[PDB]
């Protein structure tokens, strides 16, 4: 029933669908109807995909950014398996042919009709790629583990598909009437009002008269801009404050509605409390109408006037110094801005990637200059993904500009889209209207790729406790669910597990304040062994990675950290996945995990960029996902310990040492006996270089032995990223205990140590070349509202860390100075 689906969506998104209807908002109504149709169309297309296309939708290939290997292969309806010897260069089809030939000799009598499932995972190997190009195979080679695969027939894939079925004449100056305000404060009240096009003022800000602290102004506010010159995306921004400065509240609104109609007449603005003008703030009023200060205004009846259609703009806009033009096209002066604008045609024809620079010189407060700009924009060639990411910033607020950026981003691969998904979702917070090209783009890509769809859901769901985005995000999630009834239920199962983990964690938090850790742990186990917990916590797809299946919860192995927020350690097993099904999740409640996730995703991007240049620094890109209000999950890295635990140098252990500096190397020797030691020291060296460069570039501070871990393989990785971008200029960090392992436990080993410096330098030089990508992604991330990513000074930290203004030679000299200073500081 449509009624059952509505109650399921309401529970899933954390907001009743009845709340949307109660708003009596035609913009909400049209978004709902329009996006419902769009997502239902995509669902209809999905249910008729061919079986290979269904594999591409549900299990998109996990590929990496000659040698002999053994692979174990079984068929779906059998316990019997065959271990084959194949090559890393061999394709899945050859492996499937071997499997079918062996089955033919066992059962006594077409490879193209099959796909290879990774046992107990929603992950498949298919396509014309050598086995070593698959992430799963690549992972198996590095850990030494034997790949375990299942031959799955096209009819079984089709069965999965089927079961998952669903104007320019108005020359008068712009003016408003400030009628009256509301709510208490300590002084006089002043309303500051400015017209903005993104971060840029369209004219000077006008302030009304001072009135004593239900204030009544009934004052006319006149602006230094003609009504005809208001750009389509013009924002009227307000700041209510007190004066003897005391900030109280702010509110913004678009001057044109979602139907392009110029707004008239009376508007009640439910204001948001302050941390004066906030142009990047939402243009929707505070939903807490009970307690919020309100400002009533009047938009004079200029008479029904709409913004001119594209056909009108283009009609109007249709109507040796080349040297200095080039030198500034790779902050600028007035004569330089005039050069760019005069030669705008030369920008379009010979420097199309300089569109951003031309957009920034355009006079957005003059309709003639805007029409001239829009005329070139509508015939502008599509730009690279990198250029388009810059155009998504609040610095380019125009709707046509926004639409052009999306058009250039349509060529993003699913892998690239996934890499930038977090930032694209954040950009939604800058959107002026509910129905927009970004939302339609995201929803379309989410419905065409189940992994994208999973993370789009979680990035929206995890901010439902934020009133400024709850309506927009709730509406997007509802549209998504209309497009995928099956995935909605899959996501509901994840939500049921998370609700139980929150209840369990609250119980642990209370109990641990009264009894011992073994007693709270045994009480935790009794709670988990309740039928409703065993059921809710088992048989789900991991919110951290939908390809990871969390099958049977292993209660005996579950525990908690008897410190700070008391995070839970939840272990799982899967008889079908074998050793690969042994996975864990950390549930933590009380900390905002958004910065943690951003830091890990930036490190993961670094790893991708390094790997693209043939550099594998053996990183550990473990998952981190906010799921709710100060709630989220962390993927467990098994067979790892903290540096602090190893450094304790406890007795009656294989790691005990004569000197504390040897504890780490002795631990590595115990985990890697004989010939295996050399591979472990190399794993340590590579990862140490990766994380040294990563933490320096990102300005990750407060690094100690308690937030650095080591895998038994020798790989080093970081945890608990509470601080970044130097928000306590953090220098490069080198640790003597780590120098000791790199140097193979020798006091003097300049051969090994300088090979490590070379890894650092190469890693650093690679990231420098992609400096712009980091800058564009961090600029979009400013929309998130993270306290450590709030201004130009936070972005400046990255420019400085990557030394982007300098030449590669100058940058490497500067890096060598910082590395050498870190070497002297290391004892
Ligand atoms: C019980 C528990 C709940 S939460 C928690 C975290 C950690 C460590 C510090 N952190 C990570 N451990 C593995 N994978 C990760 N992704 C992280 C993180 N972040 C350990 C713990 C202590 C000592 C040795 C091995 C583990 C631990 O027992 N817990």
How does this structure look, described?
The PDB classes it as transferase. The entry lists the keywords mI3Kd, inhibitor, complex PI3K, transferase. The assembly is monomeric. The entry is titled "mPI3Kd IN COMPLEX WITH inh1". The protein is α+β, with helices and mostly antiparallel strands and 827 residues long. The chain contains 31 helices and 27 strands. The strands form six sheets. Strands 7, 8, 9, 10, 12, 13 and 15 form a seven-stranded antiparallel beta sheet that branches. Strands 19, 20, 21, 22, 23 and 24 form a six-stranded antiparallel beta sheet that branches. It starts with a helix and ends with a helix. The structure holds ligand 8TK. The ligand Cc1csc2cc([C@H](C)Nc3ncnc(N)c3C#N)c(-c3ccccc3)c(=O)n12 binds next to β20, β24 and β25.
The major sheet is characterized as:
7 strands, antiparallel
Which class do the helix and strand fractions yield? alpha+beta
Please name the fourth-level CATH homologous superfamily of one domain.
Answer: Phosphatidylinositol 3-kinase, accessory domain (PIK)
Bound molecules: the ligand Cc1csc2cc([C@H](C)Nc3ncnc(N)c3C#N)c(-c3ccccc3)c(=O)n12
Strand and helix map with partners:
Layout: H1 2-13, H2 18-22, H3 26-46, H4 51-58, E1 68-75, E2 81-87, H5 92-106, E3 114-118, E4 124-125, H6 135-143, E5 148-153, H7 154-163, E6 173-181, E7 188-197, E8 200-201, E9 206-207, E10 211-212, E11 216-226, E12 235-243, E13 246-254, E14 265-270, E15 272-273, E16 294-299, H8 310-317, H9 322-327, H10 334-342, H11 344-350, H12 355-361, H13 367-377, H14 385-391, H15 399-409, H16 414-427, H17 437-448, H18 450-461, H19 467-483, H20 485-511, H21 517-528, H22 531-537, E17 540-542, E18 545-550, E19 552-553, E20 559-560, E21 568-574, E22 578-589, H23 594-612, E23 624-628, E24 631-635, E25 640-642, H24 643-647, H25 663-671, H26 676-698, E26 708-711, E27 716-718, H27 736-742, H28 750-769, H29 771-781, H30 792-801, H31 808-825
Parallel strand pairs: 1-5
Antiparallel strand pairs: 1-2, 3-4, 3-5, 6-11, 6-16, 7-8, 7-9, 7-10, 7-12, 12-13, 13-15, 14-16, 17-18, 19-21, 20-21, 21-22, 22-24, 23-24, 25-26, 26-27
Helix pairs in contact: 1-20, 3-17, 3-19, 4-7, 8-13, 14-15, 16-18, 16-29, 17-18, 17-19, 18-19, 19-20, 20-21, 23-26, 25-26, 26-28, 28-31
This protein binds the ligand Cc1csc2cc([C@H](C)Nc3ncnc(N)c3C#N)c(-c3ccccc3)c(=O)n12.
GO molecular function: 1-phosphatidylinositol-3-kinase activity; 1-phosphatidylinositol-4,5-bisphosphate 3-kinase activity; ATP binding
Organism: Mus musculus (Mouse)
Enzyme class: transferase
């Amino acid at each position: 029933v449509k009624k059952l689906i509505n109650s399921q969506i309401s529970l899933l998104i954390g907001k009743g669908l009845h709340e949307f209807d109660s708003l009596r908002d035609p913009e909400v109504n049209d978004f709902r109807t329009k996006m419902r149709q769009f997502c239902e169309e995509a669902a209809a297309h999905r249910q008729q995909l061919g079986w290979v296309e269904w594999l591409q939708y549900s299990f998109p290939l996990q590929l990496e950014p000659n040698r002999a290997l053994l692979v174990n292969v079984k068929f779906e309806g059998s316990e019997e398996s065959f271990t084959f010897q194949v090559s890393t260069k061999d394709m899945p089809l050859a492996l499937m042919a071997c499997a079918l030939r062996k089955k033919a000799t066992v059962f006594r009598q077409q490879p193209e009709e099959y796909a290879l499932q990774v046992n107990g995972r929603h992950e498949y190997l298919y396509g014309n790629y050598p086995l070593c190009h698959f992430q799963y195979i690549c992972s198996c080679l590095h850990s030494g583990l034997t790949p375990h695969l299942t031959m799955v027939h096209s009819s079984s894939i089709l069965a999965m598909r089927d079961e998952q079925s669903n104007l320019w004449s108005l020359e008068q100056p712009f003016s408003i009437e400030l009628i009256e305000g509301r709510k208490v404060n300590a002084m006089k009240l002043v309303v500051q009002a400015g017209l903005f096009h993104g971060n840029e003022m369209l004219c000077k800000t006008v302030s009304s008269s001072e009135v004593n602290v239900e204030p009544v102004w009934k004052q006319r506010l006149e602006f230094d801009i003609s009504v005809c010159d208001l750009p389509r995306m013009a924002r009227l921004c307000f700041a209510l404050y007190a004066v003897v400065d005391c900030p109280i509240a702010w509110a913004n609104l678009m001057l044109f509605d979602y139907k392009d109609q110029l707004k008239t007449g009376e508007r009640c603005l439910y204001m948001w409390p302050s941390v004066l003008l906030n142009p990047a703030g939402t243009v929707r009023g505070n939903p807490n109408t009970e307690s919020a200060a309100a400002l009533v205004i009047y938009l004079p009846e200029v008479a029904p006037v709409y913004f001119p259609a594209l056909e009108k703009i283009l009609e109007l806009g249709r109507i040796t110094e080349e040297e200095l033009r080039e030198i500034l096209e790779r902050e600028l002066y007035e004569h330089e801005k005039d050069l760019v604008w005069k030669m705008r045609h030369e920008v379009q024809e010979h420097f199309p990637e300089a569109l951003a620079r031309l957009l920034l010189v355009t006079k957005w407060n003059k309709h003639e200059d805007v029409a001239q700009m829009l005329y070139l924009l509508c015939s502008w060639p599509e730009l690279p993904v990198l250029s388009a990411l810059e155009l998504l910033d609040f610095s380019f607020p125009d709707c046509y500009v926004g639409s052009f950026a999306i058009k250039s981003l349509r060529k993003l691969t699913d892998d690239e889209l996934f890499q930038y998904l977090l930032q694209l979702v954040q950009v939604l917070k800058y959107e002026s209207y509910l129905d927009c090209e970004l939302t339609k783009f995201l929803l379309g890509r989410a419905l065409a790729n189940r992994k994208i769809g999973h993370f789009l859901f979680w990035h929206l769901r995890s901010e439902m406790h934020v009133p400024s985005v709850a309506l927009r995000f709730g509406l997007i999630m509802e549209a998504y669910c209309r497009g995928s009834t099956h995935h909605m239920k899959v996501l509901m199962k994840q939500g049921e597990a998370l609700s139980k983990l929150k209840a369990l964690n609250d119980f642990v938090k209370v109990s641990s304040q009264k009894t011992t850790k073994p007693q709270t742990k045994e009480m935790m186990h009794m709670c988990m062994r309740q039928e409703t917990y065993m059921e809710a916590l088992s048989h789900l797809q991991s919110p951290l990675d939908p390809s990871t299946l969390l099958e049977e919860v292993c209660v005996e192995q579950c525990t908690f950290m008897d410190s700070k927020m008391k995070p839970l350690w939840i272990m799982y097993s899967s008889e079908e996945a074998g050793s690969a099904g042994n996975v864990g999740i950390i549930f933590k409640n009380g900390d905002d995990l958004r910065q943690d996730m951003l830091t890990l995703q930036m490190i993961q991007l670094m790893d991708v960029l390094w790997k693209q240049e043939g550099l594998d620094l053996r990183m550990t890109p473990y998952g981190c996902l906010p799921t709710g209000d100060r709630t989220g999950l962390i993927e467990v890295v098994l067979h790892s310990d903290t540096i602090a635990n190893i450094q304790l140098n406890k007795s009656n252990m294989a790691a005990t040492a004569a000197f504390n500096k040897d504890a780490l190397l002795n631990w590595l020797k115990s985990k890697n006996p004989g010939e295996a030691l050399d591979r472990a020291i190399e794993e340590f060296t590579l990862s140490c270089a990766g994380y040294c460069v990563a933490t320096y570039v990102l300005g990750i501070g407060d690094r100690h032995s308690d937030n650095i871990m080591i895998r038994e393989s020798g790989q080093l990785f970081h945890i608990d990223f509470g601080h970044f971008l130097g928000n306590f200029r953090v220098p490069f960090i080198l640790t003597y205990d780590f120098v000791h392992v790199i140097q193979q436990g020798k006091t003097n080993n300049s051969e090994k140590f300088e090979r490590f410096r070379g890894y650092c330098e190469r890693a650093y030089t690679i990231l420098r070349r992609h400096g712009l990508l980091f800058l564009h992604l961090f600029a979009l991330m400013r929309a998130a509202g993270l306290p450590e990513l709030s201004c130009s000074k936070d972005i400046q930290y990255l420019k400085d860390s990557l030394a982007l203004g300098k030449t590669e030679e100058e940058a490497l000299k500067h890096f060598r100075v910082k590395f050498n200073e870190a070497l002297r500081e290391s004892w």
